[PDB]
């Protein structure tokens, strides 16, 4: 799995913002430099296998589209009511061994890439089907989006999986912490348990009351750290005088089968 | 057609005091993406915080991670602040710590 994304902020007519990154599966591997027109390669193997001359071809691709698409936004952007100022999203890829290409305005599901051809989602509107209009005018440049999906993108997978699975296949231990959460009520504590810094993203992690899972246990979102970990929060809503024998135990695929257990003891009772 | 901020707060590690540690605010959810967020040390703006390229999810909501490398010390209280143009007011959301035993016994 691989996509592209592009962020186009159109402010007023004279004032735009693109930002475009690449993803391999949820890992960030190429940035847009908007100044100097410039494919930026995050790690060495985000080069793929494609030699310096097939990336300038790229770029040059991208950049002359990237030049027609704000011309032709602000062209027809009145004919379209695209009332500044206005956001518009694109999300391309594919999964090697699935092909899309979506296109939201102001944060909504407008148009999409499907085949040959450009489709209006339903419910955005004939605004939409203007759109598709305006996309679909020349077929040749659709037959190139739809080889970059096709083609090019499965192709790209190939020498970047494979150059880089020494990344997406490492396995990094959580390291685990005890804290009290904010109290929930009269008489009640909330118990928190800190899981953080593990790779890869699956998790397991429970209140317990020794070898019984504890069904308060609430899981927050998983969060990003910089360093391409994870980090989540478990808490448990307990009365005062019942949280005796409480532990918090983390499974994860890196510490084969040595489960973390952390025991709600010490100064957090706190004992005497 | 807004969609307000999601503003989350943690630390890389446990807090020890003197030892350094990262502080983070994942601010997700919003829409549009125009948005500030600053990481505050005792209410003061903290200088030349990093973030992550500005990205969004399935429901086209935007997301982003601001982080800084820092030291608490025990007198110290850490934040993030967002602004954005759902916001009255700028919201401001606090690293929760616990700081160990508050009544001494020794
Ligand atoms: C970070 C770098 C990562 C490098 C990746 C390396 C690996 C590459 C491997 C696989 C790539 C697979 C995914 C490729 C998806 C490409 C989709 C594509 O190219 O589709 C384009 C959409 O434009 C783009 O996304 C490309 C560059 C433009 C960006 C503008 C700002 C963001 C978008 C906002 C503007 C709205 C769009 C339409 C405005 C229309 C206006 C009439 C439309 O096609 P078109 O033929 O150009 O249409 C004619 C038009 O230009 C003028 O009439
Ligand atoms: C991709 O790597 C192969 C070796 O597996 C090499 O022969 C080829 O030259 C590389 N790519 C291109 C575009 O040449």
Redesign the pocket.
């Given at each position: 799995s691989?996509?592209?994304?592009?962020?186009?902020s159109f402010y007023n007519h004279s004032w735009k913002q693109?930002l475009?990154?690449?993803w391999l599966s949820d890992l960030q591997?190429?940035?847009?430099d908007s100044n100097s027109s410039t494919?930026?390669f995050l790690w060495p193997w985000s080069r793929?296998n494609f030699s310096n001359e097939e990336?300038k071809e790229?770029e040059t691709?991208?950049?002359?589209?990237?030049?027609?698409?704000?011309?032709?936004?602000r062209?027809?952007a009145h004919e379209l009511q695209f009332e500044y100022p206005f956001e518009?999203?694109?999300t391309?890829?594919?999964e090697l061994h699935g092909s899309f290409?979506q296109?939201a305005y102001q944060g909504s599901d407008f148009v999409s890439?499907q085949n040959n051809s450009?489709l209006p989602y339903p419910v955005a509107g004939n605004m939409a089907k203007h759109?598709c209009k305006?996309?679909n005018?020349?077929q040749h440049?659709?037959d190139?989006?739809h080889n970059?999906?096709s083609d090019?993108?499965p192709?790209?997978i190939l020498g970047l999986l494979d150059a880089g699975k020494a990344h997406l296949q490492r396995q990094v231990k959580p390291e685990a912490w005890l804290s009290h959460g904010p109290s929930p009520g009269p008489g009640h504590l909330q118990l928190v348990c800190h899981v953080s810094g593990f790779y890869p993203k699956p998790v397991w992690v429970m209140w317990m009351r020794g070898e019984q899972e504890q069904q308060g246990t609430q899981r927050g979102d998983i969060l990003p750290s910089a360093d391409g970990t994870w980090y989540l929060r478990a808490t448990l809503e307990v009365a005062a005088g019942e949280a005796a024998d409480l532990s918090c135990r983390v499974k994860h695929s890196s510490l084969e089968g040595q489960d973390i257990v952390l025991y709600w003891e010490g100064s957090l009772v706190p004992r005497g | 057609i807004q969609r307000t901020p999601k503003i989350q707060v943690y630390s890389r590690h446990p807090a020890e005091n003197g030892k350094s540690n990262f502080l983070n605010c994942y601010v997700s959810g919003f829409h549009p993406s125009d948005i500030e967020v600053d990481l505050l040390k005792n209410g003061e703006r903290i200088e030349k915080v990093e973030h992550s390229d500005l990205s969004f999810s399935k429901d086209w909501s935007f997301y982003l991670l601001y982080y800084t490398e820092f030291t608490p010390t025990e007198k110290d209280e850490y934040a993030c602040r967002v602004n954005h143009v759902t916001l009255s007011q700028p919201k401001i959301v606090k690293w929760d710590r616990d700081m160990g035993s508050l009544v001494p016994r020794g």
């Open positions: 691989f996509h592209v994304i592009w962020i186009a693109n475009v990154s690449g591997t190429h940035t847009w494919i930026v793929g990336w790229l691709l991208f950049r002359i589209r990237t030049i027609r698409s704000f011309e032709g936004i062209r027809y518009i999203q694109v391309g890829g594919c290409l296109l890439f450009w759109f305006v996309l005018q020349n440049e659709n190139i989006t970059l999906l090019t993108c192709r790209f | -």
